[PDB]
């Protein structure tokens, strides 16, 4: 087989691998997540194609049950392993324990493997970040993101891939109370978030809510073109 | 060391001087100055096609040059001087907007070295351009005197005549030689400047 | 452990790209697929007169129907021999049935392509010529190093096989006789190889409906009458 | 890069494996042999840099089998080496098929464990040539010589080592009149190859001598006694 | 990179675990206490936006009752320590019906440190040293105590030590304000101090994180109510 | 970039016009002077290689030679007009450099190796052009220090010998001249699909 | 061992990506131009063929072309021996499904199961990647006809046209600009792969020979899958010939 | 750049006058001057045993209580000489310019036979470099033998004046012989740099190939 | 290329005669020449111990004739001959290693490099003879305007004291170049003869290809 340490140390003491991984995230296309009140709001933008793709292959929002739902931004590659492996989790979690999966449990498993991609032998860590957010029991909903590290944080408003720290500026100056307050305002404060970092996309925003004991339901783009018709 | 918010801002201010400078030279500035030399190099009395007429006669007290090849040497001389002043200015800009010197994240660094070499050719031939004009003084000035100390070699009035016309022929390549020091330069700082100007930092990871 | 095939800047295999340029340094090996067989002839060239021609053949069966020449490293064949008649008996056991051409060189170049992929192995510096016959169609395949295989009524390959393509240009035609088809490579090679030409330098084998057949030289003397 | 370990050179070469070919060559030790009519010669150098060394301690004749012999060129590192790893297939080849290997599949056997050397970068190839010889009820003297590249054939007569060259050509010479084969007389023309090319007469103990017959299929040894009677008796 | 993983210096000293004890530098600045009425451990959660949850980060989590934890540098390489430290933590209570003291605990720790490497083993194997430096703390029935590691591997008793960035001038400042027999609350007293003085934001209960273990009192993470009243009785 | 609107578009004159200009060169002005030079070469004077023939007459105890400066009237407009058309042909390279990046940089070094080579062309024919002036410089202090020079005959007859050999000389360089044009030609046409497009500028997202 | 030889295809640039996948993207371009739509009627695949000599033979039923399964074929564009692997083991994972479930793989799925295989020796192994690009056709149960487009670094995407190998920024550009978004089906949409097969290839005068064109239709609840007649792809051919003048 | 029949073939022409030509460079013209070089450093003007053969006379004498000449023989020598350097160097630029001519595009890929053509374009830069420093060497000899007879001329008093100017007169003599001998040799140097490598020069990479990778 | 059989023939005569005057070189020019300098380093004219003695005093002033030093122009006879000699034959060694250079293959090249080495260590000693050459027109330069310059004038008298020096600093040079010389002669023979194995074979062609 293949054994040998891949990421090593440097003379500074960072990781010449680990930050050209976290350079590979920013490179990809810019997606945003919030946690809003009694509900939860994805999002990320559409590089435009020209009358060609299909979108079903190409929607970056997922769902890894009916409780949590995903995104990601980085490279498409090693975005899908996570995605297949976490809903593995998700059958063999409540296979294990008849109580549903929680928002917190799945997520540290997640990072958890990125972390053992990273130290282990031969192995690569990944270029995504991913945002795990779903709702937990008694509806407290609860949006986390992931690192190709292996860290997870927890968020209110966050924003990944290019232009994530642009974004996040927008965030702190414009989250408040007034943010996430109601459904409509929650989608509309995701779609404000990916104006600033769009350049004559237009309809390229594509939306997905997630309501209570429902699953996660993805808007029309009539739906969407609804609340981005409001702007000024 | 401590801090100085007046002294040490001053030093700031002289980097964002030049910060505005730059911008303003690059979308103001050069795109004009450039087309300058191109009208200059038009010119027709660049364009002569018959360097004979242009020979001085000497006489063998009424001893005199060429008029006009020293105006064209009067005319491209503050062009000369013009592009020497403009590349000291990016030379020191390019130095100020070296970050600090770390072992990682050090390829952007190695870049505005890249580009900081290629001004290096031209603060030589800038200087050789015009010490080989002032050469030309002292070649043809001898020449004469050496014709005019023994009076019997016809060769030194033919010497005068083809350095009348090595003067014309330098002056047309050294006008192409400023046009290019303008214009390549100028495409060089644009070919890297937009997202390259800070080429990392501002990005890190999200932990440590 | 590690595959040291990488993709060149170009995007080429410099490590394939070197397998053929041994390739193309060895002996000459030209075929033509004519009639109801199919010819391969090589170059057997010894390195003095004190060594046996017939201890060694390049020419060798695979099974009753098939059988392969080769150009290229001597030792990197033995590997594929095994390897190749393993297979086609892996195979006689699953279908009771004699090995088709195509389901064995397919398998075959899966070889080398594990090789071309697997750490710590270099590519084969070998190309071969597949020959076989079955239901009544002939087949001439020629491989590469690389692993692709790929169908050709004539071929040629080794040294000198641009002048050797040149010859199938123009004396290869159609609705050519199997025997005629021998003699014309031998005036392919009548260019290329150079000096004293006998039955013993020359190695042709063919494969017909009554199957794969190695010729002996005293039948190949008969056939350099040319 | 490529003239260190085993790949595939710009021009199709391989530099570990003819870096090979010459330490083989650098041993120092010229080999010859010669495959008769009803027997086959081997004739090797064999040296004794000090007294206090061994004659049977030290020998380039070794037996894979009852009836096949082995003699090695190359730095006895890899010589003791190939021939264990022999005698693990020999054996093993009548366990499983039931009578003693033919040489054929012997020198196949033993290549294809050279082959992966130079297929695998893990190892390297071993720095002797094998010349392996024996007999078989159909095609009779059997001489064949495995390079650690893995390539072996029939050679009528081959040699190795410093002087392989000029033993080459003398080796032609004789074959070159269409040297009547018998068995002493053949041991002479592998002796007298030794003798011409260094320009010596070497002592009785400065060779050694294998044999094999038709008569006898187990390999042997040349006694040094014979060695002696056949050197100043007859040198004609 | 044209060096090796185990390659030696010509001083005597480790490529990898040279950069390992340098790359802590970087880390969160933390303070262990161990003081003859209990053991105290405070860590700087250091929170890069509002956004980013100071509650759900925790540096120090309850491996027993008794043991609590300390984090800095990479967050996730002290998680895969602590998550095997707990495992065998229970184990020890499995077989032997008892509370694991503080040392076996750090024993554990060390095994699994100097397990690190490369090739002669499985893929399950940690490749490189973690760059979090670990401080446990505890009390049993043979009183508080509290141990130093460093991504060498090595446990220490030790009254207290200083971690993170700050560790150059908080160690040697721990030095000076801790003597004889100074407690719980005259040990958050002094520590707050050195901490905020470090630090480059001011002293809140939501930018760091405290908690103490007594030999009545098990390990008890300070809610709101206690982490408010210290930082005012400073 | 936030650059002042105006003037921004004047780039596309030497960006392409001029740019275009010296396309028309390469293919049209380069081989049409290569069959000038030809007329230039089957001139029988430089084939002389006697040196009464050659040398003119010269009466010291001033007549000079105008032969050689009929020749230099031939040799100094064509090899000074090539040092421009090299001049072009490294802005023409400057133009198609792309942005700064590290792979697919191997259409960068093409351009570096042929703007290499450009530059030892363009130095070659300087210093032709500084020993064009060196001719009436050398021959001019020759004759004037064999003036004063009357009962040696050596240093007087020796004056001719750069007069023969200013013959040799610019027939080495008009013949050096000629390939000039054929190496500039023959060195940027191979080459140049990839040095108008370095990077075939593709760049596929996937991530 | 030798960690000086060792390439380590793990290692990311300093820009942020991997330098096999990037080459291996380039070593595609190098290879046959080949296209393919995904119409009303069924999908539509065709494929030039860059080898073109007078002893050339091809006796399999298509060069570039393959049958995935009953339901779905393939194309292929890049090295030319890494398609043969996954080619078997395209074939493997739609076998396997038919064991469990007894049912026909869906398009998605059988797509979505090889990149991740692909994936893999990118994510760790040492060993190298695939440098080959596979469109991909058939028909599911439900989402129909489909047609999709994937990259040797395991990313893919549904495409409704699109072109691969050489010639890819010219195809694609004079593709959409005459594609009829579910509009033009086979019979018509067929002229326009002849058409555009002409403009790709630098050699005039397009052969039926130096090109293949594959179809795939579900008719009459039965999936059928043929590989177009010369004879007549040449009168097709025929076609595009009177086209200029007319 | 647009493509034309004529104006393109007028260089492609040029490479195969420049073929021809070599052939005749390496198979005649090289040969035929080795044997002439070779009589003429054989002659018995550049066979004198003594060196003191050819020192000029010159009549200067020293004042004690004019005729000056150079020597006749040396500028014969020196006149057939000259014309042999300006045929050798022209020829080795037409040979410099003939293998640059045959340089491919720019490729790693079997570039190494190109790396051939590097080492042969650096072996005739070698002699051109002592080729045209030889034209120059005996356009010193002129102007350093010409003012050394006017300084002996200038102090008739010192005996090294006189001295020197049969010095330059032994020296220009061997430097004649060396001269020939580099040109001669320089023939068959070239001759045998390109002969050896003729098939990778002629043929850098293969002549048309590639398998469709 | 193509090319008639005299055309071999001019090449062939010249690798004939440059072979056998290289073997000469080495097995008789080189023996001889190196005890020869040795004969001339113990000959009593190279051997003066007194170079105060050597030197040629000229008077400061129909003014009379002003000779050189009898001793340095005497043994300048000796020495210059053997400088245009070793260049000479130099190049004889330089052209032969160059005609030995194998057919240039982009591997195995280590035979070449040998070669490579032993052409530098000859153009190493090339170099220093031609400034010899220098050494031997120098004197004669030094010299000869100095005393003219020492003639002419006649208030600085310390001219002839550097002229003093010059008849000192000759002989030393003219000893220490033909010391040198018969080094080179050493040097020359130790590292051709043993690296005569390389220099002419140096390839096998043991290549089983």
Request: aromatic content about 8%; glycine content about 6%; overall charge negative.
């Amino acid at each position: 087989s293949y054994d040998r340490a891949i990421t090593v140390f440097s003379p500074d003491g960072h990781l010449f691998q680990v930050e050209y991984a976290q350079e590979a995230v920013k490179k990809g296309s810019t997606a945003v997540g919030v946690r809003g009140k009694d509900i939860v709001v994805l999002g990320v933008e559409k590089k435009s194609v020209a009358k060609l793709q299909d979108e079903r292959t190409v929607r970056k929002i997922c769902a890894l049950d009916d409780n949590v739902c995903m995104a990601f931004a980085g490279l498409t590659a090693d975005a899908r392993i996570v995605i297949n492996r976490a809903r593995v989790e998700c059958q063999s979690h409540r296979l294990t324990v008849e109580d549903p999966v929680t928002v917190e449990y799945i997520t540290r498993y997640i990072a958890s493997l990125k972390q053992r991609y990273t130290q282990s032998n031969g192995r690569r860590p990944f270029g995504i970040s991913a945002l795990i957010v779903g709702f937990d029991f008694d509806g407290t909903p609860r949006l986390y993101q992931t690192d190709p590290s292996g860290t997870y944080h927890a968020w209110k408003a966050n924003a990944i891939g290019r232009g994530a720290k642009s974004v996040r500026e927008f965030l702190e100056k414009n989250y408040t109370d007034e943010a996430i307050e109601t459904d409509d305002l929650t989608i509309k404060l995701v779609i404000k978030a990916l104006l600033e970092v769009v350049q004559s996309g237009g309809k390229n925003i594509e939306l997905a809510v997630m309501r209570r004991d429902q699953p996660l339901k993805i808007l029309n783009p009539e739906e969407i073109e609804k609340y981005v018709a409001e702007i000024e | 060391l401590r801090v100085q918010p007046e002294a040490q801002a001053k030093v700031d201010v002289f980097r964002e001087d030049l910060c505005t400078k730059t911008e303003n030279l690059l979308g103001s500035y050069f795109p004009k100055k450039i087309s300058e030399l191109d009208a200059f190099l038009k010119e027709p009395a660049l364009n002569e096609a018959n360097l004979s007429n242009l020979k001085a006669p000497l006489d063998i007290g009424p001893v005199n040059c060429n008029e006009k090849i020293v105006v064209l040497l009067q005319r491209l001389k503050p062009e000369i001087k013009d592009v020497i002043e403009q590349l000291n200015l990016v030379t020191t800009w390019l130095q100020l907007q070296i970050p600090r010197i770390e072992d990682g994240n050090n390829f952007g660094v190695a870049v505005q070295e890249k580009v900081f070499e290629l001004m290096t050719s031209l603060h030589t031939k800038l200087e050789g351009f015009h010490t080989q004009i002032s050469k030309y003084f002292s070649e043809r000035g001898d020449a004469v005197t050496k014709a005019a100390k023994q009076p019997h070699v016809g060769d030194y009035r033919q010497l005068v005549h083809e350095l009348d016309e090595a003067e014309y022929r330098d002056i047309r390549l050294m006008v192409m030689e400023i046009r290019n020091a303008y214009a390549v330069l100028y495409d060089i700082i644009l070919k890297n400047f937009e997202k390259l100007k800070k080429p990392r930092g501002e990005t890190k990871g999200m932990i440590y | 452990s590690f595959s040291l095939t990488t993709f060149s800047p170009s995007g080429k295999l410099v490590q394939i790209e070197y397998a053929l340029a041994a390739v193309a340094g060895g002996a000459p090996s030209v075929g033509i697929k004519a009639a109801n067989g199919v010819v391969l002839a090589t170059e057997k060239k010894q390195k003095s007169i004190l060594y046996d021609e017939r201890s060694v053949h390049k020419v060798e069966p695979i099974t009753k129907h098939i059988g392969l020449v080769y150009s290229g490293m001597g030792p990197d064949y033995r590997v594929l021999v095994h390897r190749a008649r393993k297979l086609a008996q892996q195979y006689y056991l699953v279908y009771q049935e004699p090995i088709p051409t195509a389901q064995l060189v397919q398998r075959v170049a899966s070889v080398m392509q594990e090789y071309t992929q697997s750490g710590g192995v270099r590519p084969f510096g070998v190309s071969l010529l597949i020959c076989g016959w079955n239901e009544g169609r002939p087949y001439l395949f020629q491989s590469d190093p690389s692993g692709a295989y790929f169908a050709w009524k004539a071929t040629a390959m080794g040294k000198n096989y641009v002048n050797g393509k040149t010859f199938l240009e123009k004396r290869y035609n159609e609705d050519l006789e199997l025997e005629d088809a021998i003699h014309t490579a031998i005036l392919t090679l009548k260019e290329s190889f150079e000096g004293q030409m006998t039955e013993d330098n020359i190695e042709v084998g063919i494969c017909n409906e009554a199957g794969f057949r190695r010729l002996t030289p005293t039948e190949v003397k008969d056939y350099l009458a040319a | 890069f490529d003239r260190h370990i085993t790949i595939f050179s710009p021009e199709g070469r391989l530099y570990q494996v003819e870096y090979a070919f010459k330490a083989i060559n650098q041993g120092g030790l010229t080999s010859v042999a010669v495959r008769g009519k009803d027997c086959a010669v081997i004739v090797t150098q064999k040296k004794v840099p000090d007294k206090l060394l061994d004659s049977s301690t030290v020998t380039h004749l070794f037996k894979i089998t009852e009836n096949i012999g082995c003699v090695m060129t190359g730095m006895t590192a890899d010589s003791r080496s190939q021939v264990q790893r022999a005698r693990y297939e020999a054996a093993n080849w009548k366990y499983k098929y039931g009578y003693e290997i033919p040489v054929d599949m012997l020198c196949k056997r033993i290549a294809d464990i050279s082959q992966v050397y130079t297929q695998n970068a893990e190892m390297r190839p071993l720095g002797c040539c094998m010349i392996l010889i024996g007999i078989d009820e159909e095609q009779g003297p059997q001489v064949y010589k495995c390079d650690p590249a893995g390539y072996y054939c029939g050679f009528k007569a081959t040699a190795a080592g410093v002087k392989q060259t000029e033993s080459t050509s003398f080796l032609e010479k004789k074959v070159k009149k269409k040297f009547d084969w018998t068995f002493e007389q053949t041991v002479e023309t592998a002796i007298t190859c030794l003798s011409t090319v260094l320009s010596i007469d070497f002592k009785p103990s400065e060779i050694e001598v294998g044999v094999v017959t038709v008569e006898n299929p187990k390999f042997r040894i040349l006694t040094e006694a014979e060695i002696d009677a056949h050197l100043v008796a007859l040198a004609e | 990179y044209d060096r090796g993983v185990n390659t030696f210096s010509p001083e005597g000293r480790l490529f990898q675990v040279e950069y390992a004890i340098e790359a802590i530098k970087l880390g969160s600045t933390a303070i262990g206490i161990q003081t003859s009425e209990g053991v105290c451990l405070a860590v700087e959660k250091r929170i890069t936006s509002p956004l980013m949850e100071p509650s759900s980060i925790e540096k120090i989590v309850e491996i027993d009752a008794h043991i609590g934890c300390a984090m800095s540098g990479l967050i996730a390489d002290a998680k895969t320590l602590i998550d095997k430290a707990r495992v065998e933590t229970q184990n020890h209570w499995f077989t032997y019906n008892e509370t694991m003291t503080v040392e076996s605990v750090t024993q554990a720790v060390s095994n699994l440190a100097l397990q690190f490497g490369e090739e002669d083993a499985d893929p399950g194997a940690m490749s490189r040293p973690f760059g979090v430096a670990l401080l446990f703390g505890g009390v049993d029935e043979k009183g508080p105590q509290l141990f130093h590691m460093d991504p060498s591997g090595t446990f220490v008793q030790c009254d207290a030590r200083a971690i993170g960035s700050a560790s150059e001038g908080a160690q040697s400042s721990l030095q000076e304000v801790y003597h004889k027999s100074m407690t719980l609350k005259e040990a958050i007293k002094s520590s707050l101090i050195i901490l905020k003085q470090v630090m480059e934001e001011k002293l809140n209960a939501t930018n760091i994180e405290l908690a103490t273990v007594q030999p009545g009192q098990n390990f008890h993470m300070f809610t709101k109510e206690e982490l408010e009243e210290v930082i005012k009785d400073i | 970039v936030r650059l002042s609107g105006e003037a921004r578009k004047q780039v596309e004159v030497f960006r392409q016009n001029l740019f275009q200009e010296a396309e028309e060169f390469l293919y049209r002005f380069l081989p049409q002077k290569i069959i000038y030079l030809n007329q230039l070469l089957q001139e029988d004077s430089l084939n002389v290689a006697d040196l009464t023939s050659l040398r003119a007459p010269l009466d010291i105890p001033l007549p000079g030679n105008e032969k050689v400066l009929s020749l230099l009237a031939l040799v100094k407009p064509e090899v000074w007009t090539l040092k421009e058309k090299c001049i072009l042909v490294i802005t023409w390279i400057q133009h198609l450099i792309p942005k700064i990046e590290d792979g697919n940089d191997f259409g960068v070094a093409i351009q570096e190796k042929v703007l290499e080579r450009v530059n030892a062309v363009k130095t070659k024919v300087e210093a032709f052009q500084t020993t064009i002036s060196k001719y009436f410089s050398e021959r001019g202090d020759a004759v004037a220090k064999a003036s004063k020079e009357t009962h040696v005959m050596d240093y007087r007859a020796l004056v001719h010998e750069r007069d023969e050999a200013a013959y040799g000389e610019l027939r080495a360089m008009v013949l050096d001249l000629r390939a000039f044009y054929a190496e500039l030609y023959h060195i940027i046409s191979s080459n140049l699909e990839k040095i108008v497009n370095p990077k075939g500028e593709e760049k596929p997202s996937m991530y | 061992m030798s960690r000086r030889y060792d390439s380590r295809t793990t290692i990311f640039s300093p820009e942020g990506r991997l330098y096999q996948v990037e080459y291996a993207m380039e070593a595609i371009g190098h290879a046959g131009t080949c296209l393919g739509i995904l119409a009303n009627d069924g999908v539509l695949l065709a494929a030039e063929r860059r080898n073109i000599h007078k002893l050339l033979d091809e006796v399999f039923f298509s060069e570039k072309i393959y049958k995935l399964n009953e339901d779905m074929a393939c194309s292929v564009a890049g090295i030319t021996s890494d398609a043969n692997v996954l080619t078997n083991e395209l074939r493997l994972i739609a076998q396997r499904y038919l064991l469990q479930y007894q049912e026909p793989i869906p398009c998605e799925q059988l797509v979505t199961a090889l990149c991740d295989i692909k994936q893999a020796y990118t994510q760790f192994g040492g060993k190298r990647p695939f440098g080959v690009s596979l469109l991909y056709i058939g028909w599911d149960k439900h989402y129909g006809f489909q047609l999709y487009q994937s990259d040797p670094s395991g990313n893919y995407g549904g495409w409704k046209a699109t072109c691969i190998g050489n010639n890819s920024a010219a195809a694609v550009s004079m593709l959409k600009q005459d594609y009829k978004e579910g509009e033009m089906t086979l019979k018509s949409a067929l002229a326009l792969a002849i058409k555009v097969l002409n403009k790709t290839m630098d050699v005039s005068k397009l052969s039926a020979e130096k090109v293949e064109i594959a179809t795939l239709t579900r008719e009459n609840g039965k999936t059928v899958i043929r590989v177009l007649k010369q004879k007549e792809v040449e009168q097709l051919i025929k076609k595009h010939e009177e086209e200029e003048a007319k």
